[PDB]
Amino acid sequence: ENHGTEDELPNYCFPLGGVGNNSTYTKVKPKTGQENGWEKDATEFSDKNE
């Protein structure tokens, strides 16, 4: 009795960590006197940010 099946919504599988693969970022902070000036932030924050 071939009546097909519910298939209305896509089903998905994801990494153990949720997110999956990532890249390394340095922080930056803005120069306040400029409209578009930035300066690295290596103060209390890590240089290897995920």
Binding footprint of another protein on the chain (CB under 8 A): 31-37, 39, 42-43
Closest contact distance (angstroms) between CB of 35 and another protein is 6
Considering the complex, state which of residue 2 and residue 36 has its C-beta at the smaller distance from another protein. 36
Considering the complex, state which of residue 6 and residue 35 has its C-beta at the smaller distance from another protein. 35
Q: Which residue has the tokens 């240089």?
A: 47
Closest contact distance (angstroms) between CB of 34 and another protein is 5
Assign residue 11 a region (left: φ > 0; alpha: ψ between -120 and 50; beta: otherwise): beta
Using alpha carbons, select from 23, 26, 30, 31 the residue that is nearest to residue 45.
Answer: 26
